Design a protein around this ligand. Structure first.
Ligand SMILES: C[C@H](CCC(=O)NCCC[N+](C)(C)C[C@H](O)CS(=O)(=O)O)[C@H]1CC[C@H]2[C@@H]3[C@H](O)C[C@@H]4C[C@H](O)CC[C@]4(C)[C@H]3C[C@H](O)[C@]12C
Ligand SMILES: C[C@H](CCC(=O)NCCC[N+](C)(C)C[C@H](O)CS(=O)(=O)O)[C@H]1CC[C@H]2[C@@H]3[C@H](O)C[C@@H]4C[C@H](O)CC[C@]4(C)[C@H]3C[C@H](O)[C@]12C
Ligand SMILES: C[C@H](CCC(=O)NCCC[N+](C)(C)C[C@H](O)CS(=O)(=O)O)[C@H]1CC[C@H]2[C@@H]3[C@H](O)C[C@@H]4C[C@H](O)CC[C@]4(C)[C@H]3C[C@H](O)[C@]12C
Ligand SMILES: C[C@H](CCC(=O)NCCC[N+](C)(C)C[C@H](O)CS(=O)(=O)O)[C@H]1CC[C@H]2[C@@H]3[C@H](O)C[C@@H]4C[C@H](O)CC[C@]4(C)[C@H]3C[C@H](O)[C@]12C
Ligand SMILES: [Mg+2]
Ligand SMILES: [Zn+2]
Lengths: 1340, 154, 148, 45, 72, 50, 49
């Protein structure tokens, strides 16, 4: 079950859980989101259609000039993606709106349609997403990180603790709609519900109940239960309920029929309730003093003269009990309250409600909302009925209304978009019950409260904003009834809409530079989930509920992969299987568990519904039919996992990588690392700069291939076929005839990207991993980009590390790297800087790029060509002139004796100043490119035409090669059609090939296909013609530079950094350390066989930093290279494919019950020698994250090689040749080279530039500015008595403008002594204080 | 208000014209005048503001029509200017960015911290002038008072 | 030169907000002089005096009487009081701790062979920190004729 | 401006003020409780 | 040392003090009451045998637990 | 291009070698470069002031 | 070597399901996800300190 190019290097997969659901498209979020956005589906689906349906049509305010929306279209980009990268312009698509404007010439009837104007107006260019879910916004490549913001709905938060300083938890609910006013129901330290509409004063909570036309009686009927008293011949007997008298204190002796159950003072038992039900007692006799404190339920009036004996919410008393018995009342209904569970809150909040009836409720709401205005009946009722109950203003969106219904345990998933009295009452009910103990508040760091945005939603929102601005402006224009003389083009702008979407995609906190020193960086920065930016919390505000990881993250956000440091827990990253709901919530798949068998149908559960079900565990065996083998299985029900019955589970997890992200899936042995260690490991792995040539992990987790293919660096097949021509630049694929369309014969052709600078200046380029005439299949890798080997992500190199001290050279976390590691060039990296020389137009005159530069030797201009620019390929070192340029400078007013020294030697003073672009200090790399842009209508120099002539020749010669490829394929298909029915055997190939498009055949549908092929060939000829013409016209156009510049000369340099002391290397388990020496090979701790270890690592970093994963991977890598050494020996002392096949088949089974059934008998004998060659340097080994190889498997694989089972070797000192006591761990560990390169960290300065306003060291060489001698260092030098050090550190070396130039003389004069003076910081401060009215002077 | 006093002293009942339509004439005049005068730090005169305004008004038009964007070639086409003073006009229109712009850096840095100094002479270039003064005083000392005095004086 | 207006790349200048505030004070002061010498309607003169007062207070301490004005790019213009005070002011951030010459920065490694009083300093990082001393010592030993 | 400091929701930083400006701001508050027509800005005045 | 190396001491203090306060919440000594201090009923032999020195019956304990759950 | 820092001092600096960096300054004048020799020198400071 | 004992949620809420495993032997998915709680709390706390 392995493809042809999949027995090249098969990874021996450990891991026993079969895979039920293959890893989805990793970049699915970005891609399908924008496909949602830039999409023509005329319905309720979001996108641009939604924006235009919302804002249009527009109408005059009874002036009746309707400007309505007809349709729209996406105009194709005027520049390719790569030309947008080169020429410094975003990659957009003009957005045409077929708009229509009917003039409602209104007389009758009711404004009939009079005349119409349809026009296609242009409103902004919307940036587009490339094939890899990324944008090109100014030539730089950017990514719109998805945002995770709270949703419309109702949330019950407590605000426990610090509030009120009495310890008492508060409880407030909030209805936050998509658009409208908030609505808060806040408890208070004295328990009575309040209200607070947006942030106004806290009205009571019964005022809104009254505003809904609820009188007191049915309000108390809503929020309470009822206790019934009646005079059944003994003084208002009680209508007793069994359950309600639980956990109470006996207020009296509750007895029945002579049966004594409750003695007062005797607190109620549960035995008491069990017996009160076992006797079925409902009507009892009680003291008359019990009804004293309680509260009536309805306004009890008398009928003698309508005597208001008692109204609702009026507590009784024995006097009112007498007044109630005297008027002959039997029913006495009271609020059943109790301070434990049925707390009285509505009662007290009515007793504090200063209002009594509805209209006063409205008027107090009005005085709250819009104060000062005298309120009235009509305006108040209108305000209330247009607060939340009018679709004009309020909007609980579908997201919000779904959340609202689901939060109150409703079954209707979609209702109105406006609040109902039922809805508000139910919110208050649920809030009171959350106060009662029935339920507990939601955690606002829930993943069920926060929904996810994306680039296809935030762009659309910015578009709606621009549309609303332009619609208001169009209303303003149309209100002035000019005439029929205009169609909807002059009334519509483009600066507003274009400016809105531009200021989104170009300067936002969610539109970031794409990380590019990896496949992993790109593909894991397109999957980020930020909580910053617009519409979400911020590092300032947040916060510690948000930094944290809630139980709902399982399968939705990686809990171990987050950028630690300042914003940790604010940039959480998606997991592998996590999709987004239709509403924006994050779903993860679970295999449905039927009666007892795990069905293979997966349900994508959201984060809100996931708590109801008993979701089982992925580490769960199965009886080969979906049957759990254990008695009770471990599941997780509502946050907390536990043992649950086998025939109780509703779901099982899909795989065990379901919880770790794409980054934290490439860590072998994640199970064995301390979680913070895996966090630092994923973060550091996300920076491993590519090396000169890639190298597969000797110990992987199988996810490298998915990550590399899902990324875009790899070039992979669109259709299977035979590789007809390979090359460093391009691959050509004669398509398999089965996968070929009917017409347009064709053969695929992939032009690889050779050397080019990433966003981090590291190198991007692709190598063909397929040879001439090699069968490719669809979805297969033909070009392995940077950091990938045969389509497997390879950030590092597997180095032979020995865990041992070695003389202090790895003291804290240093790494002692041998010199064979820098000899063999297995950490050299290629770095592509770009320098640029712009020739602006100063007032004194435009500058020039002449190679006649003043005051320079004839060696300095050796490398420059005739026009000034450097040659291509000129090896350069720091200081050399890349682009000689001279600026106009005249005059200068030379001084005295310099005057005499120019009058003596007669060397004139040149009227030009030297400002040429020279290589930085320290950089030393070949100039691999030169690009010259010019202002339009400015004479191109001699060497700006040596580029365009060569570029036109290359373009036409490439569109010639491609048309020869395509015509070769078409003629091959034509010949194949003439294999029968028109077959000329041996001079058909001799005939003119142009005399093939209409050759004589049996004129059946075969001739139809041949006419297809001929017409395809002619269309191809014309297509290549106009391709070359448009390419020429684009190459020979004047580039558009920013104003003031004439020509920009860009020079791309390709330095080759080599690993050296100072540079920072790291394993994948978060074991960082800067390599702090390069040892001779003869000093490395070698073994009895003679081989030196390559790297030496401190043992002591394992126990403290609890990451056993790194030593486990040392052992397993030693095993995997030991199974490769045997194969290599067998392959050099040639045995034959039989015995080699035998050993590989042994090494490939080698474990417990694993799903890596591989048998080397379905392999052609030369298919086993390609494999046997690619396993020569060690066999790869897969190890899924929490499904890895167990230690017994490691020992067995060691024993299969001839290594020691203990994982440890005896090693001899390289220098003294003696043997280390206590054998050492030595194994092959995968080591990454982060780009915290020392060649960038190291800088220094003595005297350079200075700032203009605050004359302090500025620098600007990145960074020639000195070091910031901050405040803590001032205290450190006051701690010593170092007064002179401090003084010179803040006056002579920093600020004092005379003292510093005066001391640079004294240093050179052999005199180490300064005259400090007074810092220009203090002179400026004096000038500023004095520039107030404050006279500040210096008393002599 | 100042233009209103101006028009009130120049309002006439003899045409029988209502006050507002004419005082608003004078008021729009004076208000646009003071806008063009004191709304920009680097004062361009009022005619330059009118020229940049007509350039902008022919820019939105040429954008909505020609699809892509105006250009100095296109604008010198549609407008009656010589293709180069339009260059300098569109160079002139932009506002000085504030020197307290919050830069996109770590230290809360601003745009005023990176503006280097092009007038200062580097202390290698003052100690390369005092060395020259000493050298010339030496080489002149190797000379008669005739040459020395006449060269220090010339 | 404390409130400078500096030429940037492209001819678009760069100015400190104090020029905006001084300009707003000066225009309003000239207009008050104008209105005073017109015998203007004294309510307009009241408004001019009030606006000039507000301008002088934005100049002295913006955002201390009303709301910060404004700024031209929708951010509160900083005034002299803002130039002194604040964590990012002048008493604190360049008065107590400032940038310093004769200083470098590099990744530290270990090197266990050192004696306790000494540390390895890269040759490349040392040839830049001691350039004055090296120029002096070259010109002193006669290995080089002059400082150049 | 007198202190306490206002917010919207181990709060141990410092007080910063004061016995002189405390009663000053308290006096201004007691007065401003009766400040009826006190917009106090130019555009509205 | 590294940010993952003092974060350990933070988490360690945290879980340590948490377990400490919780296993201090338990009662190990003996002062046999034989009757609740809230409802007066005899704390049964079973409950008083699980927790030596229990001071309240089951239901009074549940009530007080709920009340303290609201933090009142 | 990397400062080699004596191991014993790293407890003083609270500095390990996982990529940390350090700033170097030159005490220029005579009185300022006898204070690095007499007060701020690594050998005179072996006891913690706390 | 021993067991990892009881994890703790960030607000001091000790989880009752204890990680009865060490890093030498494995940690299955649920125990690891439980431990990440206190892990990230400690990390965020030393991001302020
Ligand atoms: C003959 C062979 C097919 C086998 C029959 C044909 C099929 C397409 C041909 C290549 C392409 O044209 C591109 C390119 C054009 C250059 O100009 C010359 C070199 C290249 C590589 C060509 C060589 C050769 O001719 C190829 C492989
Ligand atoms: C370092 C900073 C990025 C950090 C976020 C970049 C982004 C834009 C840069 C300025 C502009 O280019 C204008 C100007 C160009 C001159 O030629 C050199 C100085 C200037 C002031 C530059 C300083 C600095 O370099 C800036 C602020
Ligand atoms: C606010 C923005 C932050 C970037 C995130 C800052 C950082 C540096 C600023 C630019 C530089 O000054 C160079 C240039 C000077 C021109 O004259 C005016 C335009 C330019 C492009 C400036 C506009 C803007 O202000 C920039 C982009
Ligand atoms: C982790 C921390 C060191 C940080 C480096 C040490 C230093 C002091 C320790 C606490 C106290 O000892 C009191 C108490 C003792 C009990 O025995 C166990 C719990 C207590 C709360 C301890 C928890 C923890 O162990 C502490 C915070
Ligand atoms: Mg460190
Ligand atoms: Zn009890």
């Amino acid at each position: 079950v392995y493809s042809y190019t999949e027995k090249k290097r098969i990874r021996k997969d450990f891991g026993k859980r079969p895979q039920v659901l293959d890893v989805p498209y990793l970049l699915s979020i970005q891609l399908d989101s924008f496909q949602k956005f830039i999409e023509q589906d005329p319905e309720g689906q979001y996108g641009l259609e939604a924006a235009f349906r919302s804002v249009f049509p527009i109408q005059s305010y009874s002036g009746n000039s309707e400007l309505q929306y007809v349709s729209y279209r996406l105009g194709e980009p005027v520049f390719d993606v790569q030309e947008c990268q080169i020429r410094g312009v975003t990659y957009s698509a003009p957005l045409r709106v077929k708009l229509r404007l009917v003039i409602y010439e209104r007389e009758a009837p009711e404004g009939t349609v009079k005349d119409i104007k349809e026009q296609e107006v242009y409103m902004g260019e919307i940036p587009l997403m490339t094939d890899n879910g990324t944008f090109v916004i100014n030539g730089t490549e950017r990514v719109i990180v998805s945002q995770l913001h709270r949703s419309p709905g109702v949330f019950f938060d407590s605000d426990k603790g610090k509030t009120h300083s009495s310890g008492k938890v508060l409880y407030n609910a909030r209805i936050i709609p998509y658009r409208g006013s908030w609505l808060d129901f806040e408890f208070d330290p004295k328990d009575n519900l309040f209200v607070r509409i947006d942030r106004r004063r806290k009205l009571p909570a019964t005022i809104i109940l009254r505003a809904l036309n609820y009188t007191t009686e049915q309000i108390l009927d809503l929020f309470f239960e009822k206790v019934i008293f009646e005079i059944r011949d003994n003084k208002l007997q009680m209508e007793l309920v069994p359950e309600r008298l639980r956990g109470e204190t006996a207020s009296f002796d509750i007895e029945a029929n002579g049966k004594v159950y409750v003695e007062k003072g005797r607190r109620i038992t549960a035995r008491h309730i069990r017996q009160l039900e076992k006797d079925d007692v409902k009507l009892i006799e009680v003291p008359v003093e019990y009804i004293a404190g309680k509260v009536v339920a309805k306004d009890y009036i008398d009928e003698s003269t309508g005597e208001l004996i008692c109204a609702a919410n009026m507590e009784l008393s024995l006097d009112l009990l007498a007044k109630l018995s005297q008027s002959g009342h039997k029913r006495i209904e009271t609020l059943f309250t109790n301070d434990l569970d049925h707390g009285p809150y509505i009662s007290e909040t009515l007793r504090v409600d200063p209002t009594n009836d509805r209209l006063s409720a409205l008027v107090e709401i009005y005085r709250m909302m819009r104060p000062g205005e005298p309120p009235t009946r009509e305006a108040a009722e209108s305000l209330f009925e247009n607060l939340f109950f009018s679709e004009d203003r309020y909007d609980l969106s579908a997201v919000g209304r779904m959340k609202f219904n689901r939060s109150l345990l409703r079954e209707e998933i979609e209702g109105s978009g406006i609040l109902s009295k039922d809805d508000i009452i139910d919110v208050m009910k649920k809030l009171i019950d959350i106060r009662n103990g029935k339920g507990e508040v939601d955690d606002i760091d829930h993943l069920g409260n926060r929904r996810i945005r994306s680039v296809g939603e935030m762009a659309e929102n910015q578009f709606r904003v621009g549309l609303v601005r332009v619609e208001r402006a169009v209303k303003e224009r149309l209100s002035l009834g000019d005439l029929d003389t205009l169609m909807p083009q002059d009334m519509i702008n483009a600066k507003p809409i274009s400016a809105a979407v531009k200021e989104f995609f170009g300067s936002s906190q969610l539109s970031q530079f794409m990380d590019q020193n990896n496949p992993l960086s790109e593909i894991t920065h397109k999957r980020r989930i930020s909580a910053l930016g617009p519409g979400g919390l911020t590092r300032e505000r947040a916060g510690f509920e948000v930094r944290d990881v809630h139980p709902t993250h399982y399968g939705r956000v990686c809990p171990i992969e987050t950028p630690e440091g300042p914003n940790i827990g604010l940039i959480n990253s998606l997991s592998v299987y996590a999709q987004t709901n239709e509403y924006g919530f994050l779903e993860t798949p679970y295999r449905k568990v039927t009666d007892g068998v795990v069905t293979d149908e997966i349900h994508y559960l959201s984060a809100i519904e996931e708590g109801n079900y008993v979701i089982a565990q992925a580490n769960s065996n199965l009886d080969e039919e979906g049957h759990f083998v254990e008695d009770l299985v471990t599941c997780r029900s509502k946050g907390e996992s536990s043992l649950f019955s086998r025939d109780q589970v509703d779901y099982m997890d899909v795989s065990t990588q379901q919880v770790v992200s794409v980054g934290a899936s490439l860590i072998p042995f994640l199970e064995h690392d301390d979680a913070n260690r895996a966090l630092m490991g994923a973060n550091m792995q996300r920076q491993a700069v590519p090396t000169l040539r890639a190298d597969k992990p000797l110990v992987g987790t199988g996810m490298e291939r998915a990550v590399a293919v899902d990324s875009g660096v790899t070039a992979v097949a669109k259709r299977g076929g035979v590789v007809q021509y390979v090359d460093a630049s391009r691959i050509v694929i004669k398509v398999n005839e089965d996968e070929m369309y009917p017409g347009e014969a064709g053969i695929d052709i992939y032009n690889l990207t050779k050397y080019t600078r990433s966003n981090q200046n590291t190198c991007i380029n692709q190598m063909p991993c397929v040879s001439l005439g090699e069968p490719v299949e669809r979805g297969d890798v033909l070009a392995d980009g940077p950091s990938t080997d045969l389509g497997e992500l390879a950030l590092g190199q597997n180095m032979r590390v020995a865990f041992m001290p070695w003389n202090g050279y790895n003291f804290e976390d240093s790494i002692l790297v041998s010199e064979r590691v820098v000899q063999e060039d297995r950490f050299t990296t290629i770095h592509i800087q770009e320098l640029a020389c712009v020739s602006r137009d100063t007032k004194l005159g435009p500058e020039e790029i002449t190679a006649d530069i003043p005051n320079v030797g004839e060696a300095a201009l050796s490398k420059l060509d005739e026009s000034g620019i450097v040659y291509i390929g000129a090896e350069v070192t720091g200081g050399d002139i890349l682009v000689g340029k001279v600026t106009p400078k005249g005059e200068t007013q030379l001084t005295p004796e310099e005057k005499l020294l120019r009058a003596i030697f007669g060397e004139k003073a040149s009227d030009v100043k030297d400002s040429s672009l020279r290589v930085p200090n320290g950089v030393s790399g070949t100039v691999i490119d030169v690009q010259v842009f010019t202002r339009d209508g400015v004479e191109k120099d001699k060497r700006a035409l040596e580029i365009e002539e060569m570029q036109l020749k290359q373009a036409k010669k490439d569109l010639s090669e491609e048309l020869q490829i395509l015509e070769a394929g078409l003629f091959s298909r034509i010949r194949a059609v003439l294999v029968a029915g028109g077959v000329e055997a041996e001079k058909l190939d001799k005939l003119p090939r142009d005399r093939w498009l209409e050759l004589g055949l049996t004129d059946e549908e075969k001739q139809n296909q041949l006419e297809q092929l001929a017409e395809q060939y002619d269309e191809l000829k014309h297509e290549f013609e106009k391709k070359l013409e448009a390419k020429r016209r684009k190459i020979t156009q004047g580039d558009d530079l920013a104003p003031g510049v004439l020509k920009i000369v860009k020079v791309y340099l390709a330095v080759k950094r080599r690993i050296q002391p100072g540079d920072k290397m790291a394993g994948r388990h978060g074991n960082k350390g800067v390599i702090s020496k390069i040892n001779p090979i003869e000093d490395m701790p070698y073994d009895e066989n003679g081989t030196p270890v390559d790297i030496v690592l401190n043992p002591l970093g394992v126990p403290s930093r609890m990451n056993i994963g790194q030593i486990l991977e040392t052992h397993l890598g030693m095993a995997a290279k030991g199974i490769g050494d045997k194969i290599n020996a067998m392959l050099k002392q040639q045995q034959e494919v039989a015995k080699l096949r035998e050993f590989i088949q042994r090494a490939y089974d080698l474990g417990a019950d694993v799903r890596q059934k591989v048998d080397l008998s379905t392999f052609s004998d030369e298919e086993v020698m390609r494999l046997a060659e690619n396993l020569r340097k060690g066999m790869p080994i897969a190890t899924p994250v929490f499904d890895g190889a167990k230690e017994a498997e490691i020992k067995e694989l060691l024993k299969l090689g001839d290594l020691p089972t203990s994982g440890q070797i005896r090693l001899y000192d390289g220098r003294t040749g003696e043997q280390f006591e206590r054998p050492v761990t030595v194994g092959y560990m995968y080591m990454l080279k982060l780009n915290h390169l020392v060649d960038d960290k190291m800088h220094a300065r003595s005297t350079g530039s200075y700032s203009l306003v605050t004359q302090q060291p500025l620098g600007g060489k990145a960074q020639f500015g000195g070091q910031r001698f901050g405040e803590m260092e001032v205290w450190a030098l006051e701690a010593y008595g170092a007064a002179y050090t401090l003084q010179e550190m803040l006056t002579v070396k920093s600020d004092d403008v005379n003292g510093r130039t005066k001391m640079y003389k004294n240093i050179v004069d052999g005199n180490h002594q300064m005259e400090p003076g007074m810092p220009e910081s203090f002179n400026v401060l004096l000038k500023e204080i004095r520039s107030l009215g404050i006279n500040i002077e210096l008393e002599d | 208000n100042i233009g209103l006093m101006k028009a009130v002293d120049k309002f006439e009942y003899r045409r029988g014209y209502k006050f507002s339509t004419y005082a608003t004439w004078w008021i729009r005049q004076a208000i646009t005048r003071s806008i063009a005068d004191q709304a920009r730090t680097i004062r361009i005169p009022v005619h330059m503001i009118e020229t940049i305004n007509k350039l902008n008004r022919i820019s939105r038009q040429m954008l909505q029509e020609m699809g892509r964007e105006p250009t100095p070639e296109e604008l010198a086409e549609r407008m009656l200017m010589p293709e180069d003073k339009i260059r300098k006009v569109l160079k002139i229109a932009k506002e000085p960015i504030s020197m307290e712009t919050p830069i996109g850096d770590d230290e809360d840095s601003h745009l005023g911290d990176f503006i280097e100094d092009t007038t200062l002479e580097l202390p290698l270039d003052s100690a390369t002038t005092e060395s020259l003064r000493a050298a010339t005083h030496d080489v002149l000392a190797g000379l008669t008072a005739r040459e020395a005095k006449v060269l220090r004086m010339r | 030169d404390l409130r400078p207006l500096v030429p940037l790349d492209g001819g678009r200048f760069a100015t400190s907000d104090l020029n905006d505030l001084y300009r707003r004070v000066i225009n309003r002061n000239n207009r008050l002089k104008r209105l005073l010498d017109l015998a203007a309607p004294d309510i307009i003169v009241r408004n001019e005096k009030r606006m000039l007062q507000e301008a002088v207070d934005a100049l002295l301490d913006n955002g201390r009487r009303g709301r910060a004005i404004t700024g031209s790019n929708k951010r509160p213009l900083k005034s002299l009081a803002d130039m002194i005070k604040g964590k990012q002011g002048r008493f604190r951030q360049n008065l107590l701790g400032k940038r310093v010459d004769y200083s470098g920065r590099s990744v530290i490694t270990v090197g266990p062979y050192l004696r306790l009083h000494q540390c390895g300093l890269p040759k490349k990082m040392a040839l830049e920190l001691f350039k004055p001393f090296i120029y002096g010592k070259l010109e002193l030993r006669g290995l080089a004729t002059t400082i150049k | 401006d007198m202190g306490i400091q206002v917010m919207e929701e181990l709060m141990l930083a410092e007080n910063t003020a004061d016995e002189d400006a405390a009663e000053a701001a308290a006096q201004v508050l007691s007065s401003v409780e009766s400040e009826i027509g006190r917009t106090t800005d130019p555009v509205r005045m | 040392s590294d940010e993952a190396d003092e974060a350990y001491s933070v988490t360690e203090q945290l879980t340590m003090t948490g377990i400490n306060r919780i296993r201090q919440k338990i009662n190990a000594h003996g002062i046999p009451v034989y009757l609740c201090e809230a409802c007066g009923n005899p704390i049964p032999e079973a409950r008083r045998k699980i927790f030596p020195g229990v001071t309240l019956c089951v239901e009074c304990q549940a009530y007080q637990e709920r009340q303290r759950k609201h933090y009142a | 291009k990397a400062i080699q820092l004596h191991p014993l001092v790293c407890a003083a600096y609270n500095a390990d070698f996982d990529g940390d960096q350090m700033a170097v300054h030159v005490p220029l004048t005579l009185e300022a470069q006898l204070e690095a020799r007499a007060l701020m020198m690594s050998t005179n400071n072996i006891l913690s002031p706390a | 070597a021993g067991m990892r004992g009881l994890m703790a949620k960030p607000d001091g809420s000790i989880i009752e399901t204890p990680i009865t495993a060490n890093f030498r032997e494995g940690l299955n998915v649920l125990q690891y996800f439980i431990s990440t709680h206190g892990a990230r709390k400690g990390l965020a706390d030393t991001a302020l300190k």
